[PDB]
Design an enzyme around this catalytic site. Structure first.
Site, mmCIF file in Angstrom:
data_model
loop_
_atom_site.group_PDB
_atom_site.id
_atom_site.type_symbol
_atom_site.label_atom_id
_atom_site.label_comp_id
_atom_site.label_asym_id
_atom_site.label_seq_id
_atom_site.Cartn_x
_atom_site.Cartn_y
_atom_site.Cartn_z
ATOM 1 N N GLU A 277 0.793 -1.225 0.000
ATOM 2 C CA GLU A 277 0.000 0.000 0.000
ATOM 3 C C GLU A 277 0.828 1.280 0.000
ATOM 4 O O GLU A 277 0.306 2.336 -0.377
ATOM 5 C CB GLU A 277 -0.945 0.038 1.209
ATOM 6 C CG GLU A 277 -1.938 -1.116 1.268
ATOM 7 C CD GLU A 277 -3.011 -1.056 0.202
ATOM 8 O OE1 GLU A 277 -3.242 0.035 -0.378
ATOM 9 O OE2 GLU A 277 -3.640 -2.112 -0.039
ATOM 10 N N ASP B 123 -6.593 6.049 -4.954
ATOM 11 C CA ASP B 123 -6.150 4.666 -5.076
ATOM 12 C C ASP B 123 -6.169 4.239 -6.541
ATOM 13 O O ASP B 123 -6.441 5.031 -7.445
ATOM 14 C CB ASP B 123 -6.923 3.752 -4.124
ATOM 15 C CG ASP B 123 -8.363 3.486 -4.562
ATOM 16 O OD1 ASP B 123 -8.784 3.929 -5.650
ATOM 17 O OD2 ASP B 123 -9.091 2.823 -3.785
#
Ligand SMILES: CCCCc1cccnc1
Length: 161
Positions: free
Chosen positions: A10, A19
């Site tokens: 991440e 994202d």
């Protein structure tokens, strides 16, 4: 461990970002909202942190949210009558791969993985790996999915070393 694994997958960003699906996110992959409104994302952030953040957090705050998010993924698995028996059948390394997928997609995002779950419970690792890759998940984030799949296939950390 699961924290190091997801930190690799991440990254860490201290300002609101988007994202891979275009959704407002912060920290170590903390989804804020699927709404296109940056103001809505900022409200979610302030609610999550407990102060007026203006879209920016500290590393300590990012790590705190991350611990909460990992725990939420684990508890979601343990409360789910379909996921829990498979999770409990896995060794610790493969349990990390399971948490990783739930962190990324949620319980709803993994609902279509019924056949993969059966293969994992049966410990048919190569077959499970083939089945896991036949997914929107793999096609849209192939390098991350390949690492997670290798973890399920081998029960080692080789893909993250
Ligand atoms: C089929 C992949 C979903 C991730 C997972 C695996 C085992 C238990 N819980 C969750």
């Amino acid at each position: 461990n699961i924290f190091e694994m997801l930190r690799i997958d991440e990254g860490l960003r201290l300002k609101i970002y988007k994202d891979t699906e275009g959704y407002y996110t912060i920290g170590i992959g903390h989804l804020l909202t699927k709404s296109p409104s940056l103001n809505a994302a900022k409200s979610e952030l302030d609610k999550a942190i407990g102060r007026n953040c203006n879209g920016v957090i500290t590393k300590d705050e990012a790590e705190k949210l991350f611990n909460q998010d990992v725990d939420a993924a684990v508890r979601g698995i343990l409360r789910n009558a379909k996921l829990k028996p498979v999770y409990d059948s896995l060794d610790a390394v493969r349990r990390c791969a399971a948490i990783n997928m739930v962190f990324q997609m949620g319980e709803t995002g993994v609902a279509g993985f019924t056949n993969s779950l059966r293969m994992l419970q049966q410990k048919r690792w190569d077959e499970a790996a083939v089945n896991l890759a036949k997914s929107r998940w793999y096609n849209q984030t192939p390098n991350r999915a390949k690492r997670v799949i290798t973890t399920f296939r081998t029960g080692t950390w080789d893909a993250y070393k």
